[PDB]
Design a protein around this ligand. Structure first.
Ligand SMILES: CC(=O)C[C@@H](c1ccccc1)c1c(O)c2ccccc2oc1=O
Length: 408
């Protein structure tokens, strides 16, 4: 079925020609592939000299037909169905705040060899950018875990909404005596009585400790806006300086939330869901910044590169209109200063020959990469080892022994 062609070892040859802002280069890689275990191993050499771009930015471009599909999901393996005829893989890689890659590739069998021929076009790249300036780390690890990166963005976005709304209640209630906010309903459930109180501007202190009309003296929500924004955008760089600056400010959040929360319950005897959540949001930020400092202390443990945290998902969906598939995912390169260079991926696959192919359901390919070097090779090279396995398929469980044994 073409899936029979991947039950053993398959030699792999890749070739890539491209020009990026005028700079041309050619890459040739050689190796084999084990689809039964979801593994590939290749050694790429830039035949023209020095690669004008960092090696990790070309890992995604340089044969998903060696993915391991469990016996459940082998119904959804489009890549092996299109073989030996092959498929055409076009991509668009957009680097945030920089240029974009434009690739087209033909993946096909040539004798007993799986061959990938690629053409790349790099357009509108900044020279001293993280790409054409060679500023990226030589790996494909994730500096911040996925489920923690999502926790940061969601809580900081929620913190800005709540603080901006708290600023809305403070400024209008001070100007309009007939104004009632959504949290102003009954006495003991009143925003205006909390923000309009003494402790609502500069935490009650630092006014009459400062001029009481100064610029520092400000509604407490304003400090949150600056804090949540500062935590959101610097919180993606994983550095030494950027780590303690996040932990320093996050401590100031917990000492201010504890102070403010005390006055809310015991002094004012009030209730404010916007205040309680912002306290919770600030406590979540504290423990997330605490993780990174132990991520930095255990640096030796984390140079391993092969950990399942360093994996990337490639979400696939069908394309019945063209008898193919399309996919999207994101890659976050590690730049030498600690921040992140984002790279948007948009993929489209179309079979070469005209035969029965297997259009899949919405699943994804979990991928991991290991980028090594060779001391004997003097040219600009890269040793690669990848791991692709499919996931995202189910098995509801009415027929479960626990529920069934209760219902006899
Ligand atoms: C939820 C807000 O943005 C306003 C809130 C607050 C919470 C944490 C840090 C800054 C600001 C707020 C209140 O909790 C509050 C509670 C008691 C007394 C005064 C308060 O003023 C506030 O602005």
């Amino acid at each position: 079925k073409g899936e029979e062609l991947f039950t053993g070892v398959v030699p792999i040859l890749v070739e890539l020609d491209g020009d990026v802002n005028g700079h041309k280069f050619s890459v040739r890689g050689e190796g084999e592939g084990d689809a039964t275990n979801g593994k590939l191993t290749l050694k790429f050499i830039c035949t023209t000299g020095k690669l004008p771009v960092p090696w990790p930015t070309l890992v995604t471009t340089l044969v998903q037909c060696f993915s391991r599909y469990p016996d459940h999901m082998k119904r959804h393996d489009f890549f092996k169905s299109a073989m030996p005829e092959g498929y055409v893989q076009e991509r668009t890689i957009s680097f945030k705040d920089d240029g974009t890659y434009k690739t087209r590739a033909e993946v096909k069998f040539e004798g007993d060899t799986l061959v990938n021929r690629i053409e790349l076009k790099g357009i509108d790249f900044k020279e001293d950018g993280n790409i054409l300036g060679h500023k990226l780390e030589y790996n494909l690890r994730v500096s911040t875990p996925r489920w923690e990166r999502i926790a940061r963005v969601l809580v900081c976005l929620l913190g800005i909404l709540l603080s901006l709304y708290a600023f809305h209640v403070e400024r209008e209630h001070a100007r309009d005596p007939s104004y009632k906010a959504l949290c102003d309903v009954s006495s003991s459930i009143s925003c205006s009585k909390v923000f309009g109180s003494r402790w609502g501007r500069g935490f009650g202190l630092l006014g009459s400790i400062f001029g009481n009309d100064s610029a520092l003296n400000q509604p407490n929500s304003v400090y949150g806006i600056v804090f949540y924004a500062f935590q959101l955008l610097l919180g993606m760089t994983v550095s030494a300086m950027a780590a303690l600056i996040l932990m320093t400010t996050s401590i100031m959040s917990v000492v201010g939330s504890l102070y403010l929360g005390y006055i809310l319950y015991f002094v004012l005897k009030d209730l404010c869901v916007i205040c309680v959540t912002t306290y919770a949001l600030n406590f979540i930020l504290f423990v997330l910044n605490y993780k990174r400092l132990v991520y930095l202390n255990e640096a030796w443990k984390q140079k391993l590169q092969a950990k399942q945290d360093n994996s990337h998902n490639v979400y696939i969906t069908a394309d019945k209109q063209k008898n193919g598939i399309k996919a999207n995912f994101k890659i976050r390169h590690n730049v030498e200063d600690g921040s992140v260079q984002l790279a948007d991926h948009y993929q489209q696959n179309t079979p070469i020959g005209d035969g029965p192919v297997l259009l899949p359901d919405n699943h994804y390919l979990s991928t991991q990469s290991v980028l090594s070097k060779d001391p004997n090779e003097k040219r600009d090279h890269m040793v690669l080892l990848e791991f692709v396995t499919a996931a995202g398929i189910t098995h509801e469980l009415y027929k479960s022994n626990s529920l069934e044994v209760l219902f006899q």
